[PDB]
Curated annotation (Swiss-Prot):
Residues 1-290 bind DNA. Phosphorylated by pachytene checkpoint kinase IME2, but also phosphorylated in an IME2-independent manner. Phosphorylation probably eliminates SUM1-mediated repression and is also required for full transcriptional activation activity. Phosphorylation of the DNA-binding domain by IME2 does not alter DNA binding affinity. Induction: Induced during prophase I of meiosis. Requires protein kinase IME2 for initial expression and continued transcription during meiotic divisions. Can autoactivate its own synthesis. It comes from Saccharomyces cerevisiae (strain ATCC 204508 / S288c). The lineage of its organism: Eukaryota, Fungi, Dikarya, Ascomycota, Saccharomycotina. Changing residue 139 to A: Reduces DNA-binding by 96% and abolishes sporulation. This is Meiosis-specific transcription factor NDT80.
Length: 290
DNA sequence: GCGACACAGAAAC
DNA sequence: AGTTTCTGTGTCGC
């Protein structure tokens, strides 16, 4: 009925089938680690400006809500929230040095303005993109939006428990406790330590996230979850690390820059989940029908 | 099958 | 210790 796995930090993931067991909306049992991510590929090389040394990059993603491991499949629910978090790391560069240097794409060298992550959902069988939607905590009483590109600096991925604890914090004191985990405030550094060309100072905003946290995410309400044969569709969640450049034959998405001009999110690395099943609104997907 | 509204119960304070 | 917030899901009606 409930299958329990121990997480890396000592919390548990408790997998249950909502067709058989109804658990309260805010139960800690709704929090669990989802499927592991796998490398899809590496794309454009990045090199430090003078040394010419190649920056080796690694996406560090995890799903902390919305997916259960049920008899050999990973299962989500159309109507319910999932959480996908990600950082990236640079194995061969400490953060403090990284922020002070400058980086080019090796395509022929385009200056990297900043690094960022975006997420996508796909039909895993045909590579078709599927829309994702996010809400605020107010849900229907607030706006819905599509996941945005998240400027980010390299950082360890917080433990599952930390993502849990930070999920619905209002109180100012607790916010302060978690600030340094999720944000770098560029306006608080010593500006004299940095060259005008430094990477830190080509980020678009002073408040820079250390962790991309996509919470209250759902597949669009219009997705069909079954194939015509009534077999389940297979979906997959993708995380892409990119370098944003000023575009004045390699994979990239256009990005609406801060100054207004047309920018380029140039792909560096992409990871994805194994196939995912999503259960629709059918009453037979719920324990209430029994 | 989908948008909207409603109820419920644990978290957050 | 009580109030409000958040989120899984029951339900209506088109």
């Amino acid at each position: 009925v409930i299958l329990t796995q121990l997480n890396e930090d000592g919390t548990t993931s408790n997998y249950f089938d909502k067709r058989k067991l109804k658990i309260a909306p805010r139960s800690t049992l709704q929090f669990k680690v989802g499927p592991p991510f796998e490398l899809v590929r590496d794309y454009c090389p990045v090199v430090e400006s003078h040394t010419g040394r190649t920056l080796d990059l690694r996406i560090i993603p995890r799903i902390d809500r919305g997916f259960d491991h049920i008899d050999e499949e990973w299962v989500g629910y159309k109507r319910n929230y999932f959480t996908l978090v990600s950082t990236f790391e640079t194995a061969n560069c400490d953060l403090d040095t990284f922020l002070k240097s400058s980086f080019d794409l090796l395509v022929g060298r385009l200056r990297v303005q900043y690094f960022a992550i975006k997420i996508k959902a796909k039909n895993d069988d045909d590579d078709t993109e599927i829309n994702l939607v996010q809400h605020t905590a107010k849900r229907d009483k607030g706006p819905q939006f599509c996941p945005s590109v998240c400027p980010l600096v390299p950082s360890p991925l917080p433990k599952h428990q930390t993502i849990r604890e930070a999920s619905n914090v209002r109180n100012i004191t607790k916010m302060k406790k978690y600030d340094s985990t999720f944000y770098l405030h560029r306006d608080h550094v010593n500006y004299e330590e940095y060259g005008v060309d430094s990477l830190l100072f080509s980020y678009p905003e002073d408040s820079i996230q250390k962790v991309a946290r996509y919470e209250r995410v759902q597949f669009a309400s219009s997705i069909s979850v079954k194939k015509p044969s009534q077999q389940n569709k297979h979906f997959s969640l993708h995380v892409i690390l990119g370098a944003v450049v000023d575009p004045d034959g390699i994979p990239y998405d256009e990005l609406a820059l801060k100054n207004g001009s047309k920018g380029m999110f140039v792909y560096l690395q992409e990871m994805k989940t194994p196939p995912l099943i999503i259960r629709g609104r059918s009453p037979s997907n719920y324990a209430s029908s029994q």
